[PDB]
Amino acid sequence: TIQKYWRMYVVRRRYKIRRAATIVIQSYLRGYLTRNRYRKILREYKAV
C-alpha cells in the first residue's frame, strides 16, 4: 500500500518536471523564431 503510493508520487513528479521543462523550451524556441523574423524584417526594411 505504501509502495504503490511512492511509485505514483515519483512518476507524477518527474512527469510534471518534464512537461514544465518542455513548455519552457518551446517558449524559448518560439522566442528565438520571433527574434529571427524580427531581425530579418528589420534589416530588409532599413536596407530599402
Place this chain on the structure above:
Amino acid sequence: DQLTEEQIAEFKEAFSLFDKDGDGTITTKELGTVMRSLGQNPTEAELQDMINEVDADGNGTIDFPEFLTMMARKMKDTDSEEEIREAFRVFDKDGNGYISAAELRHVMTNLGEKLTDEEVDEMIREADIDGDGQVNYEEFVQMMT
C-alpha cells in the same frame, strides 16, 4: 461527469509522450508509467492482472483505448486515503505517529512489491537521512498526496 472532450485531450497528451510512431500504441512496459504520470495509483500486481490479457513475456504492445479502458475502471476506485493510514499505522516506532528508519528499510526492500536501489536513493534524499532516524506519517501522506 465522465468524458468531456478536454479530459480525453489531457490523457492522450500523457500517452503521446511514449508512442514513437503516432499509430496510437505503446509497449506494455510503459503502461504503468503513463498511468502513474497522470497520478493514477495501481499496484504492480494490479498492472500484471491486466497484462495477462495481452502479453506473452512482458515485452508486448498495447493501444491507447485498452489503457484508457483500464483507467476508466481505476478512476472509479478509491483514493486509498484511509488505506495508506492503516498501512503506516503498522510501522510506527512507539505509537506517537512516527515511522522508524530501520522498519522503513524492510518496508522499502523486503515486504511486498519492494523498490530498486537507485529509487531507494530518492526516498533517503527526500527524508534527509545520514544515520538512525524517523518520519511522521500524517505529514508524509500529505506530501505523497
Place this chain on the structure above:
Amino acid sequence: DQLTEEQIAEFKEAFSLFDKDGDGTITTKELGTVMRSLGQNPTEAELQDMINEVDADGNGTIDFPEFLTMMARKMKDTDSEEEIREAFRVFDKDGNGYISAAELRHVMTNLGEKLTDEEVDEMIREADIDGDGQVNYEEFVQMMT
C-alpha cells in the same frame, strides 16, 4: 517597479518596428509579437495574465504610456540564463550536457505547448534542427538568443 530611459528606449527598439505610422498605439493582438521580439519568452497564458494585470482588451488598442504602465506591473520573469538550463538538465544524456535532437523533436511535437507542422517547416529552415545527431545545451541556449 519603476522604469528607466535606456530600458524604455530598448522597449521602443522592439515596439517601433510595429508602430508603422508612428501612431504611438497598436492593436492589442500584436503585443505578444513585440514582447517575444524584445527577448522575453512568455506563454500565451502569461501574455493574457499580463493583460489581466491592467484590465485590457486583447481586441482593442494599447497606447505607449499604458503599455509602459503594464511594464511597471510586469509579473512573469522570462529572461534568465539559469532557468532555461534547469529545463535542459532533465534531457541530459549522461550529465555532460548532451541532448538527443530526435527525442527533443518528438517531445516538442507531442507534449505541452506543441509545435505545429508549419512551425516544424519554419524551424527546419531557420534553426537547422538535426534529425540524426545531438547538441550540448550550453551552446544551444546561446544559439537561440
Place this chain on the structure above:
Amino acid sequence: DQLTEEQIAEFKEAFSLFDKDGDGTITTKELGTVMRSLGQNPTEAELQDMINEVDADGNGTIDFPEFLTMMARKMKDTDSEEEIREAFRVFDKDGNGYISAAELRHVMTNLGEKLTDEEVDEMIREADIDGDGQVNYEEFVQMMT
C-alpha cells in the same frame, strides 16, 4: 491643390529638363529621374505604384498636374537625416558610428530593392572608398544630405 506658387515654379523648372517640348507632359522613363532630382527618395516599387494609380494600361506619358499630384502624395512624409543615422546603427558592430564594407555590400545588393553594378561603381568613386574595410555613417549621412 497642395503647393505654393514658389514651390510650383521650382518643380516646373526642374520638370522642363525632362519634358522636352514644353507642352506640359513627361515620359514615364524619366519620371523616376525628375522625382529623385527634386529631393525625393522613392523606391522602384513606389514609382510603379504611382504610375499604375494614374493608369494601369496607359501610354508611358504623364501630364504636369498629375506629376505634381505624385509630388503631393510624397510631400506629407516628414523625412529627415536623423532616422537615416539611426538606419545605419542597425548595421554597427561596436556602436562606433561605422558600417563594414562587406555588410554595406550585402545591404546594397542582397536585401531590399537592390542597387545595380553601375550604381555601386558610381557611388564608390564619389565616396572615396579604398579597401574592403569600414565606413563612418555620421560623415556619410553628412555627405548624403
